[PDB]
Amino acid sequence: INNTVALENIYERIKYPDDISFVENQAVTTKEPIIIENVEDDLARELAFYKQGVSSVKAAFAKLREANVLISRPHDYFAEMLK
Amino acid sequence: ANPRQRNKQRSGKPRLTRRNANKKAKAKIYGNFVIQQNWDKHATLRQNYARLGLLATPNYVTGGVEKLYPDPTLDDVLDKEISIAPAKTEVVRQLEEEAVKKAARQSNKMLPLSAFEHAYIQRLINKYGTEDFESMAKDVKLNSKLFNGSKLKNLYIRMKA
Amino acid sequence: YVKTWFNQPGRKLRRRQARQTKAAKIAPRPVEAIRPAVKPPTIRYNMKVRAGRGFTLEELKAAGVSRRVASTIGIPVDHRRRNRSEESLQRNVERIKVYLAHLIVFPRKAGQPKKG
Amino acid sequence: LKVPPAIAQFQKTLDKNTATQVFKLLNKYRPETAAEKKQRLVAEAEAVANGKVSKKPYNVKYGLNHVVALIEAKKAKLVLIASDVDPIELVVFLPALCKKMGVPYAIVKNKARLGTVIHQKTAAVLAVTEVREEDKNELASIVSAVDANFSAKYDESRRKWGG
Amino acid sequence: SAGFVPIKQKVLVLSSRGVTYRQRHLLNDLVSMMPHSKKDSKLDSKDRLYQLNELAELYNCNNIFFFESRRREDLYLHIARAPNGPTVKFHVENLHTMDELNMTGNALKGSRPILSFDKTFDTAPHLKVVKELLQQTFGIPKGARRSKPFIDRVCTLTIADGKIWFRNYEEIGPRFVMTIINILEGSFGGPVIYKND
Amino acid sequence: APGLVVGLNKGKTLTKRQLPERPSRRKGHLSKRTAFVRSIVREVAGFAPYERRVMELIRNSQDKRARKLAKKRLGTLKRAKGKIEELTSVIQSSRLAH
Amino acid sequence: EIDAGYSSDSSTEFDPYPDYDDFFTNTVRETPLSSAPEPKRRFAPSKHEQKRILQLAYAIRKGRILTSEQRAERER
Amino acid sequence: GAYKYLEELAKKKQSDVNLFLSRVRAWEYRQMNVIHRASRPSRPDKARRLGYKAKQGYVIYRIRVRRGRSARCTAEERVGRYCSNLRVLNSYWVNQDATYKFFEVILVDPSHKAIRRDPRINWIVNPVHKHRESRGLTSIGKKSRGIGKGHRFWLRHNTLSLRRYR
RNA sequence: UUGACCUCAAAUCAGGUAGGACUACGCGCUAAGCGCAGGAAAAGAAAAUAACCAUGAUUCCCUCAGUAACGUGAAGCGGGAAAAGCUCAAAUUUGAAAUCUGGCAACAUUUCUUUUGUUGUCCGAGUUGUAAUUUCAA
RNA sequence: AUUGGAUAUGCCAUAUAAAGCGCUUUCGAAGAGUCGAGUUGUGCAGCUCUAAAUGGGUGGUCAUCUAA
RNA sequence: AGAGCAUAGCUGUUGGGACCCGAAAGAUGGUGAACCAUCUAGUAGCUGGUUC
């Protein structure tokens, strides 16, 4: 099993268009792997996830400001919350 | 304690005392007569069966048995015909013979014919013979009840005796 | 609530007398019916042989006891069980054959009408 | 309300003359009463007791299950359905079943008239499967009238919602 | 015709007979998480999975989310692309629902979240497919109905000890241990091409 | 001897048997009489209000809408597929004689 | 493929008295509905009355039932 | 014969034939008492498969229950108290509308000699069968308490079993 | 003008039956309240388990097992006690409603002049279905 | 003195009957406001909708059952 | 180159009313125009007591 050639072809065929905007794509997949080797422990995993989320948030906020996407939630604009 | 029970203590009427408390009382053997005449009313049914030469269980026993004395293939299991088994005791021998003799007394399973049956089969026989039962069945003028050749054969075979 | 077992020996005795009563009624014939030998249904116990419920219809056909006369001589019939292997068939066909070897069935009175 | 076509088809029954002719033929094939049948059996029983072959009877067939099985056997030559069965579902399929299986049928007035024929209080349906050779013409003439006066007539009215 | 006002992504969420309160509430949360999920009724058949494309075609969904609760004990999630596409079977354990007290997050319904993926997904071609399928599904497409232009959550997936940890941050509340079981090349069919081992 | 042995083991030699099929497994087999009865009653009883809606949607070649109604009506795609196939056959049979 | 579109009536955001339609009885069935073989009993004198005749004869022999001649002469 | 046709017709309940009858019969049923005697079952096929025989000793009673315990369970109990000299055999849904659910109850006369002498229905004469509906011993009573065979279906738990030798 | 059937009534008509009490144990509805039984009740001859060399209604006991599952808390298997299987609906008896309650008249019979039947006859029930046959093991 | 089930035997016995198991160039019916689906309250119940015929249920395409 | 298993006793400890008595409630079902009977041995960090 594990047909690498077939899997790569499927991934390329179903690959999303990278030309989409960062806000539109909403993807923050970077190149530096923020993955703690001690992720089995709760503290190391939480720190690695928080660092990845912080970098993702900063990149998204910068892209949103560049793309004129008002990421700041307005208090006046009331909508049903997820929770 | 209860008011119904004080009702009886405070009344001179006697109780419905019934004296049917017999412990160590074993049940007496009705059913058979040969077994009744060879039953030790003290011994257990296991002991009584074993002494009589019978089996109380055809299966296993779920406990240790009483020891009183220091005693010192498909085609083969399908077409085999076991020739009964010997009768270890005389009581089992007595049961065996009376059953064989009782079969001899009630051994006439064969039936006689009647007036209606005899005339029915005879009338069919005179016209068709005593060997062609298939053609006998296919006749409807004489075989009004519409018996098949197998019921006509039994009538013919039964008429002789 | 506590279930107390002070009647453990009074139950033991009552069950013996029920056996004694059952014999007194049908004393020439066994107090229990015969049972087949079946293999328990798991990887843990399939190497044991234990008593089953009744004999299959393939087992009775092969032995020679029709399913109607089987019960009348104390041979239980389990219609649910079947014979997926020949070992179970021949193991229990032989069991019926041995039981019939030792069987003394007492004749019954049969109606014999005078006419035809 | 608006009556469905399968329930409205019972309001257009068989007319005066044809029903009278139909019941005239039925009354020549009435079944045999309980009081008479006993008399016929004791006559035959007495004959066999003192000292001792017959012919198949000829009577109209009744009973819902019996008749429906006779239609599906393609045995019924004429099926006569009461028009006032209290649960109508008991006969609601009989006209369509007779159409499917090629049997002449008619919806006649009152279960009691069918009931009277067979010495019962009520009959839901009656079927004629076999008649004596003497009356083959009479049954053929009646069936032609039923076709002309019941099946040829209405016809469209049974496909239209009633009421 | 083929479809009016075609939104890029739609999600079909189902469950099998033998589902539980912890499992159903998980299904409800994911359905409420994204607005282009078409919540549907159970699938009485657990045998002919080939009919799943018929539900997707009928309901105009391209992403299929099927919940299989074997022994009503373990949750198996299949994610597939309706037109052909690869079917991926997943394992879900360590259930945490919206009633738990460790919950402290609160996002906005319809707000498009930011997709953050572990870099190990780029190490293996099958992990690339799994990562690719996840972003096209969790990522709410533009123009989705009942979707808000705001952003209030970020989904984080980290592959720890061979098991993906899907955590949503404002912790939003959805908590489970994402484990890959195997991968089917076709839509709930075809020969198996990858075993996670 | 007429007794049973309990426990131990038995010859592991195996010989499989091909058992015939049980009459209880015959359930679900359509009959000629039951097919006839169900077709008669299908005609006589008429159609449900939702079955009429489905047949008219099939008539105008709105199959996607027809399946959406039947699946919402009955409650499963499996039931919808059978209902659509049965009503489509009715449409063809009626269209022959209509 | 799928195009993930939305139907014109997607939830994500007529002759009420028709004439009878003969799609099944428009053609007549030629053959019986049952293939069960005919029993012999229908071609033979009934066994019901033969059972009844025999138990009427027994009562006549035992005098439980007044014979037709005896009953008729008793009416006079 | 025709009982097969009756049951396949009963399956189609929104059908034109059945819908018209359900509306019409619901009207006539509402014009009567809540519990009234029926001359004959309105679905003779359902009564027959549930146990009704057309002989003296068997009784059919029609009852209406307010729609929205089980209504079918409540139909059996209320008819059981009305005809208290009868045992309830079974019960079947016949009709319904927006307000009422209509049920028909099969009851047998335990004191009738035709029932007392039929070995097939003899069993209901025995006093252990008084008020089977009052004890959840009918078809819908058994289902209501989840009585059945399978994995879908109290003294034994809480007790401390202290044996003689322990 | 008559009759048949249908539906609804009446009778201090004939024959029945229900209620209330007990309630240790049973079964329900909702400890208590409410309903209903028996000498036991309930359950019960698989729309049951399993994945094996397969088992075989129900109930109970031991064990499984304080295990699995989600502090709660089993069940399959295994050991034992007891073992018993069946009845209909759905297929025309159709060469014959073969079925049954009741009245009347005899006869027999009794835990019993108190009980319970038999035979004959007449009415009624029933063909909108009472018997026989059949129950998937077929 | 009341009765159990048996045994021996007498008299009756409507057998022109009723069965079991051999075979098949013939047939073989199987329970619906239910199952199922959606949603609420405590599997069950309410309410909306409402089926099928190698079907349906329940387990691991196979096995196993055959509800109302 | 296995030391465990069972039974009994003492000791500790955990849960059962749990060393004894003593606490303001409330619930279900009734009586009289609050009362009564169960739940109830309700809730204990506490009080008083606890035998050669």
From Swiss-Prot, chain B:
Compartments it resides in: Nucleus, Nucleolus
Superkingdom, taxonomy of origin: Eukaryota
Annotated stretches, region: Disordered: 1-23
GO cellular component, one term: preribosome, large subunit precursor
Cited InterPro entries: Ribosome_biogenesis_Nop16
Oligomeric and partner information: Component of the pre-66S ribosomal particle.
Its biological purpose: Involved in the biogenesis of the 60S ribosomal subunit.
The name this protein goes by in its record: Nucleolar protein 16
Top-level taxonomy: Eukaryota, Fungi, Dikarya, Ascomycota, Taphrinomycotina
From Swiss-Prot, chain F:
Biological process annotations from GO: cytoplasmic translation
Location within or outside the cell: Cytoplasm
Transmembrane segments: none
UniProt-listed PROSITE patterns: RIBOSOMAL_L36E (PS01190)
Residues covered by region (Disordered): 1-31
A Pfam family reported for this protein in Swiss-Prot or TrEMBL: Ribosomal_L36e
Keywords, ordered alphabetically: Cytoplasm, Ribonucleoprotein, Ribosomal protein
Any single Gene Ontology cellular-component annotation: cytosolic large ribosomal subunit
Keyword presence, Iron-sulfur: no
InterPro entries listed in its UniProt record: Ribosomal_eL36, Ribosomal_eL36_sf
Domain of life assignment: Eukaryota
GO molecular function: structural constituent of ribosome
Repeat keyword on record: no
PANTHER family: 60S RIBOSOMAL PROTEIN L36
Functional note: Component of the ribosome, a large ribonucleoprotein complex responsible for the synthesis of proteins in the cell. The small ribosomal subunit (SSU) binds messenger RNAs (mRNAs) and translates the encoded message by selecting cognate aminoacyl-transfer RNA (tRNA) molecules. The large subunit (LSU) contains the ribosomal catalytic site termed the peptidyl transferase center (PTC), which catalyzes the formation of peptide bonds, thereby polymerizing the amino acids delivered by tRNAs into a polypeptide chain.
Other noteworthy facts: There are 2 genes for eL36 in S.pombe.
Family: Belongs to the eukaryotic ribosomal protein eL36 family.
Self-association and partners: Component of the large ribosomal subunit (LSU). Mature yeast ribosomes consist of a small (40S) and a large (60S) subunit. The 40S small subunit contains 1 molecule of ribosomal RNA (18S rRNA) and at least 33 different proteins. The large 60S subunit contains 3 rRNA molecules (25S, 5.8S and 5S rRNA) and at least 46 different proteins.
Protein's name according to its UniProt entry: Large ribosomal subunit protein eL36B
UniProtKB/Swiss-Prot annotation, chain G:
Subcellular location: Nucleus, Nucleolus; Nucleus, Nucleoplasm
Highest taxon above the source species: Eukaryota
Complexes and interactors: Component of the NOP7 complex, composed of erb1, ppp1/nop7 and ytm1/SPAC890.04c. The complex is held together by erb1, which interacts with ppp1/nop7 via its N-terminal domain and with ytm1/SPAC890.04c via a high-affinity interaction between the seven-bladed beta-propeller domains of the 2 proteins. The NOP7 complex associates with the 66S pre-ribosome.
Function: Component of the NOP7 complex, which is required for maturation of the 25S and 5.8S ribosomal RNAs and formation of the 60S ribosome.
Family: Belongs to the WD repeat BOP1/ERB1 family.
Protein name as it appears in the record: Ribosome biogenesis protein erb1
Organism: Schizosaccharomyces pombe (strain 972 / ATCC 24843)
Entire protein: shown range: 101 to 258 of 740
Swiss-Prot record, chain H:
Subcellular location: Cytoplasm; Nucleus; Nucleus, Nucleolus
One term under GO cellular component: nucleolus
UniProt xrefs under SUPFAM superfamilies: Ribosomal proteins S24e, L23 and L15e (SSF54189)
GO BP terms, alphabetized: cytoplasmic translation
Signal peptide range in chain numbering: none
UniProt keyword list: Cytoplasm, Nucleus, Ribonucleoprotein, Ribosomal protein
Annotated Gene3D superfamilies: Ribosomal protein l15e (3.40.1120.10)
Bias kind Basic residues: ranges: 142-152
GO molecular function, one term: structural constituent of ribosome
Region (Disordered): 134-153
NCBIfam families: PRK04243.1 (NF003269)
Other notes: There are 2 genes for eL15 in S.pombe.
Function: Component of the ribosome, a large ribonucleoprotein complex responsible for the synthesis of proteins in the cell. The small ribosomal subunit (SSU) binds messenger RNAs (mRNAs) and translates the encoded message by selecting cognate aminoacyl-transfer RNA (tRNA) molecules. The large subunit (LSU) contains the ribosomal catalytic site termed the peptidyl transferase center (PTC), which catalyzes the formation of peptide bonds, thereby polymerizing the amino acids delivered by tRNAs into a polypeptide chain.
Quaternary context: Component of the large ribosomal subunit (LSU). Mature yeast ribosomes consist of a small (40S) and a large (60S) subunit. The 40S small subunit contains 1 molecule of ribosomal RNA (18S rRNA) and at least 33 different proteins. The large 60S subunit contains 3 rRNA molecules (25S, 5.8S and 5S rRNA) and at least 46 different proteins.
Stated family: Belongs to the eukaryotic ribosomal protein eL15 family.
